[PDB]
């Protein structure tokens, strides 16, 4: 009896009637047998929506919004709101200057997104993305928490969605939140949004330009376990694009300390980041040196063991540091002065894989540029193992070209051969025939270091004679006319010495 009567009073033509009928319907929604009666009525639900949608009074809105909000606390009531076309209307209400009305709408949508199938497609037609982002400037931290969590549900697995947020200026709005407020539940969800965006390749640079790197570094030592982990996955994703930002001297300090932790997911994420920000930046390379970065890193590899997802990033981080800058010398000396040479040569041997072995040969080349390391590296027994790897690669995977393993290995022996002791060892391994064969490579790089190592060994009578006996005179003459001043200068030297 009741329902059929209220439905009619909900839309006459004279408003006071509709404005006064809304107030009545609103109170019935707080009772159980009333809601059940209201839901199963395909007309009551419809009239309610068009009223909240077309009204012009405040409280009529304040009351109609509350009526739908209560209907959303249960499955049956959601399916009804859905059929009556209530979502397009709900979005419209997201522009009200009334707090109560704004704060309901958003929560009803939140519920629809979480348990009704189809909501996602719909909320996107109504255009709920530009609106939710426009609300990010309010000041109610609890309000924000609900809003940002709505952005994360819609942006997951959808690029069209990440691009609109981006196009509406989401990146330098969220970052602001992170360096202004302290509510934990807000800072957690806002990072969950930033994370999802860091995946694509267009949405990345917008974050680093705002200052997302410095704003995310702030919460690395907070009591929240989940906030510190989401912050870390995210800094690792941006890393390969922040290699030129000034004033990163602050964040680099913290990162180093974070190598010493009980959490091994915190060590792994911290490893890669230091590895990436260390690329081609003389200002970042030095700073890490001043805060004891070398000593800390050597220690990281020691406890890592055979876990190749920790060792790999770290080794690449020592490789960058021992090259191109004012402290590159100090760097090379320190790795030794901190008992690291032993473990470095151990990673060359199996269990290891190609990607890892590649980076260690590169670290070793740099380390040999310091005289004080000639004798040590030999005693650990690197030469005999370096040669062994050269062979198996020559003939032949995992993501590594075998020609790279050959160009690196040769250049390693090239620099070591600066000390007489090493030369006597290298030569006494029937290596010459192979070195001579590399002269025939179509790769100029391999030609320089091949003719280079020969230039070194040839400074000794016996050695020179054995080289000429293989027949290097033939290829060496052709390499004289190379336009590569390196491959040339070296071909003239070997011939001079063996004559």
């Amino acid at each position: 009896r009741a329902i059929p009567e209220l439905t009619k009073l909900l839309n006459d033509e004279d408003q006071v009637v509709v404005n006064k009928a809304a107030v009545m319907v609103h109170q019935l929604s707080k009772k159980e047998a009333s809601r059940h009666a209201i839901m199963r009525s395909p007309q009551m639900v419809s009239a309610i929506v068009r009223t909240m949608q077309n009204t012009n009074d405040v409280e009529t809105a304040r009351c109609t919004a509350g009526t739908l909000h209560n209907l959303s606390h249960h499955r049956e009531g959601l399916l009804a709101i859905f059929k009556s076309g209530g979502i397009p209307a709900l979005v419209k209400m997201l522009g009200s200057p009334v707090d109560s009305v704004l704060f309901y709408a958003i929560t009803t949508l939140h519920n629809l997104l979480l348990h009704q199938e189809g909501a996602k497609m719909a909320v996107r037609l109504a255009g709920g993305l530009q609106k939710m982002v426009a609300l990010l400037n309010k000041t109610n931290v609890k309000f924000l928490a609900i809003t940002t969590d709505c952005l994360q549900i819609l942006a997951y697995g959808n690029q069209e969605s990440k691009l609109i947020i981006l196009a509406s200026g989401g990146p330098q709005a969220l970052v602001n939140i992170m360096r202004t407020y302290t509510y934990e539940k807000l800072l957690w969800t806002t990072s969950r949004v930033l994370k999802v965006l860091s995946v694509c390749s267009s949405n990345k640079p917008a974050i680093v330009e705002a200052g997302g790197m410095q704003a995310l570094g702030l919460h690395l030592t907070d009591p929240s376990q989940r906030l510190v982990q989401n912050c870390l996955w995210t800094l690792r994703n941006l890393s390969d694009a922040a290699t030129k930002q000034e004033g990163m001297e602050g964040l680099l300090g913290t990162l180093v300390q974070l190598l010493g932790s009980d959490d091994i997911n915190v060590v792994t994420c911290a490893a890669g980041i230091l590895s990436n920000l260390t690329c081609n930046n003389y200002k970042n390379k030095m700073m890490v040196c001043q805060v004891g970065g070398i000593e800390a890193l050597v220690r990281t590899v020691l406890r890592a063991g055979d876990r190749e997802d920790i060792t790999e990033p770290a080794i690449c981080a020592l490789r960058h540091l021992t090259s191109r800058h004012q402290e590159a010398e100090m760097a090379q000396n320190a790795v030794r002065l901190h008992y690291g040479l032993p473990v470095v040569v151990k990673l060359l041997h199996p269990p290891s894989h190609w990607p890892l072995i590649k980076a260690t040969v590169g670290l070793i080349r740099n380390l040999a540029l310091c005289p004080a390391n000639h004798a040590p590296l030999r005693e650990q027994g690197a030469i005999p193992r370096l040669v062994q790897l050269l062979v198996r690669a020559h003939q032949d995977v995992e993501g590594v070209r075998m020609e790279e393993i050959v160009e690196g290995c040769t250049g390693a022996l090239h620099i070591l051969a600066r000390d007489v002791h090493n030369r006597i060892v290298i030569r006494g391994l029937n290596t010459i025939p192979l070195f001579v064969q590399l002269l025939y490579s179509p790769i100029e790089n391999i030609q320089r270091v091949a003719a280079g190592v020969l230039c070194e060994l040839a400074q000794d009578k016996e050695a020179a004679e054995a080289i000429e006996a293989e027949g290097a005179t033939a290829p060496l003459t052709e390499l004289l006319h190379s336009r590569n001043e390196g491959v040339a200068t070296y071909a003239a030297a070997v011939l001079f010495r063996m004559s």
Binding site: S198, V199, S201, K204, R236, N237, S239, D240, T243, G272, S275, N276, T278, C279, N280, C316, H320, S323, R324
Partner: peptide, 11 residues
Amino acid sequence: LDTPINYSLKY
């Protein structure tokens, strides 16, 4: 020389 690694694509 020093070359980066896009961790977004590895995980």
